[PDB]
């Protein structure tokens, strides 16, 4: 959409929380990205990513086939109290749940089946989605239709972790404080100069 | 072709033997590639590579001009005894020889002229091609038509090395054993689960 | 143009002087690039670079708006005494000055405003442009129209440094000596061989 981008402009999103918190160049690079979005009012513009995005509604359907859950789509949900912070789960499930879908490279999917666990960056993403929505768990789905039937679908439930959420909110608050100050600082300097 | 891909699907090929044997991330990454090919039944899809492929018949012609050898084209030749292993030389030469052609970047070609020796990964490729076909030598040709005439063409003969071949076959056997077990293992787990 | 490329073929240019002098792989990689250009008679062929090039006349206009200077465009200017060496400033300013324009990513522009100083590689570029033209200073302009008005335009003056220029000319002379010898060496070897 264009409303898709507009709702996300200048905000810390759940999909990037791992860049915020890691112990880093990725934190500073994301900070620079959000500074430029807020100042310029626009964001900067592969095969596997595109193929992935296009498969996600297949994955969504497969999950409902496998579970019988009522799934509603949702856009960006703002954090209830931290301004400039939001999350975009791939669905609201029932009254208290969520779904986050990955449709990655085949080997990444296989490694998820092997370990049974989502990458730590996706744990952060999903805890943040829970933070923003008030939900109690998120079913993490990995899906690859290239594989034999009994390997295409993987799902595991990640329960709300209030300790991790409090730590995320602390870090994201600190990061947003630095972001807003940097923008204020740059602006005051340019204004004085002019 | 489509038969080109089909003949190569799931197999260790001579062009990748160096990834098998190196002392590595490249061995594990190739293993993952072949696992996914065998499980999914399909393979995943630059200017210099394309330009190169298109020049190889010029190089083939230049070699025959320079040598007068009878060259026959050939597709994938399976190893006589190791299943799932094969080689695709760029030509059969005479009764007992082979040709492997490179059409690389100009500087890579120049460095080949300087040292007089093919990269070790290409020694492995050519010994494997000899392993698969039973041939006795392979003429390694590097060709770049962008250069002055007296620098365009390079050729050096690599004689069959039975010791290196036995070592290649040992490594490739071990690698294929792990590959097939991994596929069996994944399948048994998924089947039990379902 | 095509005359653009022709004037630059095989020459050390001001924009690459930093690769010549750094303490390196970049020196050897540039040397290889220039060897191949001289031998083959041709050179080898992103969004931000293209967007940048297209913005440079906006930046040029903004600079004249801001300063009132008379700016003339110029192509490649050969070093007065070092053969195979030249510079392409983005404009002659007045009788004694120059302009070098960057239209980079927004964050790079912001970092230039923060530090007030061009990257060391661009100091080398501009001292070389002064070396080639005999000029006395170069105004370094960074421009990004995506930003608020009071952050779009940055300019700082870099005065001719005769010590740095003598050191550049020494290094570039040594590099050109090695380049020409390498070409002579390769040619003599190929000629003897043929
Ligand atoms: Mg999501
Ligand atoms: Mg998703
Ligand atoms: Mg081949
Ligand atoms: Mg070849
Ligand atoms: Mg320039
Ligand atoms: Mg410029």
Q: Any idea where the domains of chain A sit in the sequence?
A: 1-194
- Helix, strand and coil content of chain A, in percent to the nearest 5, comes to 55, 15, 25
Residue C150 host element (H or E):
none
Strands B85-87 and B91-93: unpaired
Q: Identify all chain B residues contacting C184, using CB atoms and an 8 Å cutoff.
A: none
Q: Please count the other Cβ atoms lying within 10 Å of the Cβ belonging to residue C62.
A: 18
Q: How far apart are CA A132 and CA A152, in angstroms?
A: 30
Report residue C148 CA to chain centroid gap. 29
Contact C141, C154 (CB under 8 A): yes
Do residues B86 and B132 make contact, with C-beta atoms less than 8 angstroms apart?
yes
Q: Where are the alpha helices (DSSP H) in A43-147?
A: 47-67, 106-115, 120-133
Q: By C-alpha distance, which of B116, B140, B119 is closest to B129?
A: B140
Nearest to A159 by CA among A121, A126, A116: A126
B12-13 and B85-87 strand pairing: parallel
DSSP letter at C25?
H
Contact list in A for residue C151 (CB cut-off 8 A) is: 39, 186, 190
Which residues precede a break in chain B, with C-to-N distance above 2.5 Å? 23, 45
Number of CB pairs, chain A paired with chain C, less than 8 A apart = 31
The side-by-side arrangement of strands in the sheet containing A97-102 is: A71-72, A91-93, A97-102, A137-143, A153-159
Contact yes or no for A14/A128 (Cβ under 8 A): yes
Question: What sign does the CA torsion over C30, C34, C39, C44 have?
Answer: positive
CA separation, residue C128 to residues C25, C30, C89, C125, C175 (Å): 21, 17, 10, 5, 15
Q: Are B117 and B86 within 8 A, CB to CB?
A: no
B186–A106 C-beta distance less than 8 A = no
Phi-psi group of A170: left, alpha or beta (phi > 0 → left; psi -120 to 50 → alpha; rest → beta): alpha
Q: Tell me which residue of C101, C122, C92 sits closest to C16, measured CA to CA.
A: C122
Phi and psi torsions of C43, nearest 5°:
-100, 155
Helices (H) and strands (E) counted in chain A, each on its own, are 7, 8
Q: Beta-carbon neighbour count of residue C8 at 10 Å? A: 17
Closest CA to B177 of B169, B166, B165: B169
Give the containing element (helix H, strand E) for C181.
Answer: helix C162-193
User: Residues followed by a break in chain C, C–N over 2.5 Å?
Assistant: 23, 45
In 3D space, the residue among A186, A175, A28 whose CA is nearest the CA of residue C144 turns out to be A186
Q: How far is the CA of A184 from the centre of ligand 3 (A)?
A: 60
Q: What angle do CA B113, B118, B123 make, to 5 degrees?
A: 170
Rounded to the nearest angstrom, the gap between the alpha carbon of residue C16 and the centroid of all alpha carbons in its chain is 6
Decide: C154 and C62 in contact? Cβ < 8 Å. no
Residues near A152 by Cβ (< 8 Å), separated by ≥ 6? A62, A143, A144, A145
Does A161 appear as a known binding residue? Answer: no
Q: How far apart are CA B85 and CA C161, in angstroms?
A: 64
CA of C84 to the centre of ligand 5 (A): 17
Q: What would the CATH number be for the domain defined by C1-194?
A: 3.90.320.10
Taking CA B91 as the corner, what is the angle to CA B90 and CA B94, rounded to the nearest 5 degrees? Answer: 155
Q: List for chain C the helix, strand, coil content (%; round to 5).
A: 55, 15, 25
Strand partners, A93: A71, A97
Question: What's the CA gap between C90 and A127, in Å, rounded?
Answer: 52
User: Which residues of chain A have a Cβ shorter than 8 Å from any chain C Cβ?
Assistant: 32-33, 35-36, 39-40, 42, 44-45, 186-187, 190-191, 193-194
Q: Which of A46, A68, A145, A63 is nearest to A100 (CA)?
A: A63
Measured CA to CA, the distance from residue B88 to residue B11 in angstroms comes to 12
- The phi, psi pair for C84, rounded to 5°, reads 80, 30
Task: Name A67's Cβ contacts closer than 8 Å, sequence gap at least 6.
Answer: A139, A155
The C-alpha angle with vertex A10 and arms to A105 and A134, in degrees rounded to 5, equals 70
A88 is known to lie in a ligand binding site: yes
Give yes or no for a contact between B83 and B124, defined as CB atoms under 8 angstroms apart. no
C151: nearest CB among A44, A45, A190: A190
> Å from A32 to nearest chain C CA?
6
What does the alpha-carbon distance between residue C67 and residue C65 come to, in Å, rounded to a whole number? 6
User: Assign residue C18 a region: left if phi > 0, alpha if psi is -120 to 50, beta otherwise?
Assistant: alpha
Task: Give Cα separations from A173 to A6, A43, A121, A125, A192 (angstroms).
Answer: 21, 22, 18, 16, 28
Q: Are strands A153-159 and A137-143 parallel, antiparallel or unpaired?
A: antiparallel
Alpha carbon distance B44, B57 (integer Å): 26
User: CB A64: neighbour CB atoms within 10 A?
Assistant: 14
H runs (alpha helix) in B97-142 = 106-115, 120-133
Residues on B contacting C at a C-beta cutoff of 8 Å? 47, 105-107, 110, 113, 146-148, 150-151
Helix residue ranges per DSSP H, C41-105: 47-67
Closest CA to C74 of C162, C14, C20: C14
Contacts of B50 (CB under 8 A, 6+ apart): none
Q: Hey, are the CB atoms on C32 and B146 less than 8 Å from each other?
A: no
Q: For residue C29, give the nearest of C170, C129, C169, C179 by alpha carbon.
A: C179
Distance B112 CA to ligand 5 centre (A): 35
Collect all residues of chain B within an 8 Å Cβ-Cβ radius of residue C33. Answer: 107
The set of residues, in sequence order, having a beta carbon less than 8 Å from that of C167 and lying 6+ positions away, is none
Enumerate the residues of chain A whose CB falls inside 8 A of the CB of residue B186.
Answer: 110, 113, 151
Residue A90 labelled as part of a binding site? yes
Helical (H) or strand (E) element with B13: strand B12-13
List residues forming the annotated binding site of C.
88, 90, 100-101
* Beta-strand relationship, A137-143 and B71-72: unpaired
């Amino acid at each position: 959409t264009e409303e898709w981008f507009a709702a996300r402009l200048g905000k810390v999103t759940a999909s990037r929380v791992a860049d915020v918190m890691t112990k880093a160049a990725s934190r500073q690079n994301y900070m620079a990205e959000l500074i430029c979005q807020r100042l310029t009012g626009t964001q900067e513009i592969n095969a596997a990513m595109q193929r992935g995005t296009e498969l996600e509604p297949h994955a969504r359907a497969r999950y409902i086939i496998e579970t019988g859950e009522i799934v509603t789509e949702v856009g960006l949900i703002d954090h209830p109290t931290i301004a400039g912070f939001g999350a975009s789960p791939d669905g609201l499930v029932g009254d208290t749940g969520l779904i986050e879908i990955k449709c990655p490279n085949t080997w990444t999917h296989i490694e998820t089946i092997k370990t049974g666990k989502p990458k730590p960056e996706y744990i952060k993403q999903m805890q943040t989605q829970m933070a923003c929505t008030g939900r109690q768990w998120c079913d993490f789905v990995s899906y690859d239709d290239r594989l034999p039937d009994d390997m295409q679908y993987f799902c595991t439930r990640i329960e709300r972790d209030d300790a991790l959420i409090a730590e995320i909110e602390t870090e994201v608050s600190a990061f947003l404080a630095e972001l807003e100050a940097e923008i204020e600082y740059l602006k005051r300097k340019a204004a004085k100069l002019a």
